[PDB]
Symmetry: D3
Subunit: 169 residues, 6 copies
Amino acid sequence: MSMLLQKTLCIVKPDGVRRGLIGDVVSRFERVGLKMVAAKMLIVDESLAKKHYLYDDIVFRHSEAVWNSLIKFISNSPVFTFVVEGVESIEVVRKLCGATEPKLAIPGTIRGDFSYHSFKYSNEKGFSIYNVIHASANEADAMREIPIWFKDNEILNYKRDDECEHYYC
Amino acid sequence: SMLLQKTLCIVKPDGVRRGLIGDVVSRFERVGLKMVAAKMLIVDESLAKKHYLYDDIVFRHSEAVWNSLIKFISNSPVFTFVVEGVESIEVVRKLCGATEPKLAIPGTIRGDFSYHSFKYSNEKGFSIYNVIHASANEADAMREIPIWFKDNEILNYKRDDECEHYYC
Amino acid sequence: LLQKTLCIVKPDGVRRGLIGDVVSRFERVGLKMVAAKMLIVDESLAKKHYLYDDIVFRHSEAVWNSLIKFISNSPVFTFVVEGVESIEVVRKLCGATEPKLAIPGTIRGDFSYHSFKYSNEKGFSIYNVIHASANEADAMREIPIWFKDNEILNYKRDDECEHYYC
Amino acid sequence: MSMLLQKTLCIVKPDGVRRGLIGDVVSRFERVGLKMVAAKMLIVDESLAKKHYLYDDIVFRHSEAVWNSLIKFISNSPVFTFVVEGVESIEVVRKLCGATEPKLAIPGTIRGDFSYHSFKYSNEKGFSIYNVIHASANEADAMREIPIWFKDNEILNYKRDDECEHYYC
Amino acid sequence: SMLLQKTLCIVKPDGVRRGLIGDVVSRFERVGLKMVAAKMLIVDESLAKKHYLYDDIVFRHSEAVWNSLIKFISNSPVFTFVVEGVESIEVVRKLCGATEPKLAIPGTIRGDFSYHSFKYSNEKGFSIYNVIHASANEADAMREIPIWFKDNEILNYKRDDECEHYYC
Amino acid sequence: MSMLLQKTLCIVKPDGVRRGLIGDVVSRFERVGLKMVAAKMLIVDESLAKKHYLYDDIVFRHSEAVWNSLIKFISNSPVFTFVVEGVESIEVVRKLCGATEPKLAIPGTIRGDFSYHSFKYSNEKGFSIYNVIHASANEADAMREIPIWFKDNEILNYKRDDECEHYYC
């Protein structure tokens, strides 16, 4: 009904997966009242990694080296990918993940509570930052990212028992 | 000490119906604040209208805002309790986080357990459902507490960690 | 099959800041809180909850006295829990009366540990965090002692359909 | 590879999903060291339900009414299905779940902590037990159940960071 | 009182390398047991051979089990600590759960944090990795404690909840 | 060995110890990925307290009254002292601990989650602030503080199983 209802793509990254953090992550979203409407576990291949992190954009905004480092992090590695639905969910999910850099991420956030290392370190070592989770940055990103990971028939429609407390009935 | 305060907290109908009473109380016990009063009740219209004063809310907000506050809590279960400690009113405000769940910082009661927005609540014609009420300030705590609790329902006892918070 | 059962966070529970922890255990399995109040128990009220004639027969005057001394003039948190066969379920979540023996996972097993041998030696009651009504009759007796009829709430938890079925 | 290494099929049932318990459930398994090797969320149609709850198995072990109840409970309702890998994982998963009947499930298990209602009440009402989770009862069930929910390419091969502590290295 | 006991605990190298020290300590603090000593160290071969005595282990089990225990803890990090309480030895055994993680009941340390079996450990030629060690009985605690701690490393102090466990 | 790897001294103060908070505190550090590399529990004698809180250092930054109240809080009382290693750990530990004053300390942090009282109240009562934990303020304090509590051979070298997610491999 309302235009404020959004879906956002979330990925528990390989660092997160290998550390056994998928549950901890999902609970955070379930706990505030956000609804999981799709989920899959997969090994990401190069091709899919290249659709998710677009060369043209990442190179425009950062560098080819940053893009290489994102691709190497995620390619041929396991991820847990899911879609979260709710009132202004893109913004709220950004709020819950915390700052991109775990060193700066505030305690209480996913990144703040589960990771700590710094961009300065990751740049020195020539790796991407390992910051547990990806979340669609904004509306245009979510509209692009979701269909890359999910077919339309993998987006589920149902009611959480607490729906009336979040959407009103 | 003049610094010792009591504040009134209410787990609102949304927190109750969601089974969050325990979760909320633990947040306060865990920092070292003391529960000195508690009761559970269905709030009647008349009690609702005393907690949320028409003249106050209207002035600071509007009639639609007051009405939706009354509609939310009236004929609905709440868990009401009083908390004591050093500058407790402020501390409690800090633990609850911002009025608007969308903005409440993770780590806060509202940030961890709710998420929706004033923008959404204004569109649908409902109050924000933000889990908990806490007295915004001292004059409010003094007015609100006697509304929910008789003087003989406020407890005096020592928490075992009292020497760590009040000193001994 | 729907039942109400009387629970009390005892003064050790209250003084250690465990009210929330205890309440959460019940809310988490799906049980509904339908009454709550906090108070200082006076001897008068303590002697009604722990009946002399009952406890003396079943244990002794010393034991009854220790019970009375434990709660008299101390803070408790009392609440009523509702659900399908809740009395037995609450018993299960509390664990054995004796913390030493209570199984991890249970309220008593997780939050306390001392033994009956120790309490007999010191002349104190067992401090085991929580009271829960032992059976149907004890609850029908206990609830009215702590709560008036109008203090017992009727409402729907949002997860009700998962427990009572709708 | 040891013959003791097993995969088992788990489902967070519609009651668990509607209650926002997915994360809580997964965490319990990640926390002991079991490894998630596949996951998906879907609305279960009747035919998939009838593949998972086989008419002949359920009517042998129980009754036709119970089969219908099992089907009515999961059909047209969301589930989160995943596969767990580890040393003797089928037994371990069953221990983690606790007794089929939540009323009897020991505190500390998934069913013990997150549900409480009984068969007596389930029978009286005409509904299946709402017991949060399904886990494969034994090796033969796990072998049958997995390909029902997952294709071979959706089962993942990776190493958890704590692997050495569970499998040895 | 002769019911008051001290017991020796060790977060084994699997628990240390997995970051479980805090998780384990909390389980003990939460029930009311008191931490009265703590040290972290790399266990040298010689100290390992004092904690797991050849004669005891070979008699009950085998030389192969003993070797495996020594290889598990030698030149590896551990967190050792001593817990005090009313019948603490028994209570600590209960909180740890069964020696074999596969059988360890959920709610226990070993039941919540580990899961593999003796069958597997025996097949692979390794010690069971079961997170924690605790003295099995009073004789063992009396033996094991002075092996890890000097008398002056055992602390005398009051927990704030003392009166709920020891009485006052 | 990147120069960004740091060691920092932490102390659960007598308030945290007497309250049974040691476990909860250590967990916050382990959970983000920081490594414990030293630990001991001891009764602090007056002499040790004066080495740790330096008269001249504390007098010029606060006052004499404050130094006295720091000495009295810690002397002849139990502490649990430990060393944390990780990338830029000094800053990270300070982020996790929160503001010196519990009243202001933000929720999600050790101090904001476990204490609450104020500098106004502590000054008024004549006592130190009771704030659960001490962490080294900077590289220099850390360098000075560690050897006061630990001898060189009490600092341990080993790998956390998640090391590659934090340090890379």
